[PDB]
Design an enzyme around this catalytic site. Structure first.
Site, PDB file in Angstrom:
ATOM      1  CD  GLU A  11      -5.825  12.458  -6.644  1.00 43.87           C
ATOM      2  OE1 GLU A  11      -6.337  13.070  -5.734  1.00 43.87           O
ATOM      3  OE2 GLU A  11      -5.318  11.265  -6.513  1.00 43.87           O
ATOM      4  CG  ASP A  20      -5.457   5.798  -1.517  1.00 39.53           C
ATOM      5  OD1 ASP A  20      -6.487   6.413  -1.337  1.00 39.53           O
ATOM      6  OD2 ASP A  20      -4.890   5.139  -0.587  1.00 39.53           O
TER       7      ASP A  20
END
Length: 164
Positions: A11, A20
């Site tokens: 991540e 994202d």
């Protein structure tokens, strides 16, 4: 290697609101803020999550606190889920990390959607399950991360991350 280090590799860590891979507003270590298009809706959610006026930015400490909460909630989610718990209980320690990783990225509901693959994991048919997991939007959209997780379920070792 542990779940935290694994997830931190997948991540990244960002201290300013970001979008994202799906285009949603996120901060820290993959902490989704909102699926809403409004940066304002995002900044509001952020302040609510941290308990201060952040103005779109947080410290390392705040990022880690959010991360601790999210991993905890992912684990508790699996254990409360009727479709997920049995699978989790059937797995060894490394593979358990792979399932937690999927749940953190895609939510309970999403993973619970991989019916067939879950059945194969429960059965310990590693190769078959790796092939089945690869036939998903998940794999097509984030192939390198999906491959790492998939290798983790396939082998039961941390080889895909020992590189990284």
């Amino acid at each position: 290697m542990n779940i935290f280090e694994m997830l931190r590799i997948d991540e990244g860590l960002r201290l300013k609101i970001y979008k994202d891979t799906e285009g949603y507003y996120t901060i820290g270590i993959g902490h989704l803020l909102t699926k809403s298009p409004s940066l304002n809706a995002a900044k509001s959610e952020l302040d609510k999550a941290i308990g201060r006026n952040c103005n779109g930015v947080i410290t390392k400490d705040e990022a880690e606190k959010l991360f601790n909460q999210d991993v905890d909630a992912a684990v508790r989610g699996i254990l409360r889920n009727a479709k997920l718990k049995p699978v989790y209980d059937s797995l060894d320690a490394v593979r358990r990390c792979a399932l937690i990783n999927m749940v953190f990225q895609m939510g309970e509901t999403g993973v619970a959607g991989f019916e067939n693959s879950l059945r194969m994991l429960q059965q310990k048919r590693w190769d078959e399950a790796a092939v089945n997991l690869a036939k998903s939007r998940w794999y097509n959209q984030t192939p390198n991360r999906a491959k790492r997780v998939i290798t983790t379920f396939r082998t039961g070792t941390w080889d895909a991350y020992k590189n990284l």
